[PDB]
Paper text:
Ucl fimbriae are attachment organelles that facilitate ExPEC adherence. Ucl fimbriae are phylogenetically related to Uca fimbriae from Proteus mirabilis and F17/G fimbriae from enterotoxigenic E. coli (ETEC). Tip adhesins are two-domain proteins; they possess a C-terminal pilin domain that connects the adhesin to the main fimbrial shaft, and an N-terminal lectin domain that mediates attachment to specific ligands, therefore dictating host range and tissue tropism.
Given the close phylogenetic relationship between the Ucl fimbriae and the Uca fimbriae from P. mirabilis, in parallel we also determined the crystal structure of UcaDLD (84% amino acid identity to UclDLD) at 1.6 Å resolution. The model was then used as a template for solving the structure of UcaDLD by molecular replacement. The final UclDLD and UcaDLD models contain residues 21–215 and 21–217, respectively. Electron density was not observed for residues 43–48 (UclDLD) and 44–47 (UcaDLD), suggesting that these regions have a disordered or flexible conformation in the crystals. As expected from the high sequence identity, the two structures are similar, with r.m.s.d. of 0.6 Å for 189 equivalent Cα atoms. A search for structures similar to UclD and UcaD in the PDB using the DALI server revealed significant similarity to F17G like adhesins (Z-score of 14.3–15.8 when using UcaDLD as the search model), although the sequence identity is only 14–16%. UclDLD and UcaDLD have a completely conserved pocket in the same region of the structure as the N-acetylglucosamine (GlcNAc)-binding site in F17G. The pocket also contains a tryptophan residue, which is known to mediate CH-π stacking interactions in the interaction site of other carbohydrate-binding proteins. By contrast, UcaDLD bound specifically to ten glycans from the glycan array, all but one of which, surprisingly, were different to the glycans bound by UclDLD. Binding for UcaD showed little direct overlap with UclD, with the highest affinity binding identified for UcaD being to neutral glycans containing GalNAc on the glycan core and sulfated Galβ1-4GlcNAc structures.
Residue numbers in the entry: 21 to 43, 48 to 217
Write the structure that this text describes.
């Protein structure tokens, strides 16, 4: 079908956080996960469409932190919303971008935001160029929000939020397709010297 687009999740892995060595200050970023990307978060319709993705985080927002991801290509710091993983002392901050590398990392610091095209955050009629899929890049960093014990800590799998597919084609827009944005759970290690 022309509008038979279906969602697929985009996921990032707790297991890529390096060991956290502590030689304190809260909040502070304790490491970045390896950024991930999915070209086909929405895919499958036979008719090309102008599409955009609205990300709504759905974990509790604890506060803000200023940061500049080592990954991505922003040259100045931004405020990021710190989201509660549920594990005391541990939050995450999120950035998302369009799939293609020229598009910028968008700090998640609003109750919802268009991750691609960023033009849509100030132009309600802006969409990606017409094509047959919508994808994205996902960036996450862990934040110490309080004192961490030594040793291993398990992070549960968390749904960071969802991307709503919007389009200037009503039949596709009105499906309100949504794709989950996932933090795959895992184990981190703190070495408190
Ligand atoms: Cl993925
Ligand atoms: Cl992909
Ligand atoms: Cl950044
Ligand atoms: Cl969850
Ligand atoms: Cl239409």
């Amino acid at each position: 079908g022309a509008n038979d687009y279906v969602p697929s999740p985009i996921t990032i892995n707790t297991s890529t956080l390096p060991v956290v060595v502590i030689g304190h200050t809260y909040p502070r970023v304790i490491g970045e996960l390896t950024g991930t990307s999915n070209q086909y978060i929405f895919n499958g319709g036979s008719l090309i469409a102008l599409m955009r993705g609205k990300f709504t985080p759905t974990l509790p927002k604890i506060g803000k932190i200023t940061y500049n991801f080592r990954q991505g290509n922003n040259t100045q710091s931004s405020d990021f919303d710190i989201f509660d993983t549920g594990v005391p002392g541990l939050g995450i901050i999120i950035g998302m971008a369009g799939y293609w590398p020229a598009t910028p990392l968008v700090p998640i610091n609003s109750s919802s935001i268009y991750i691609d095209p960023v033009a849509a955050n100030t132009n309600p009629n802006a969409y990606n160029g017409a094509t047959g899929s919508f994808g994205a890049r996902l960036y996450v960093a862990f934040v110490a929000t309080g004192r961490l014990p030594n040793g291993y800590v398990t992070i549960p799998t968390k749904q960071l939020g969802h991307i709503l597919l919007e389009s200037n084609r009503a039949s596709l827009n009105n499906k309100r397709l949504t794709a989950p944005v996932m933090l795959n759970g895992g184990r981190i290690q703190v070495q408190s010297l």
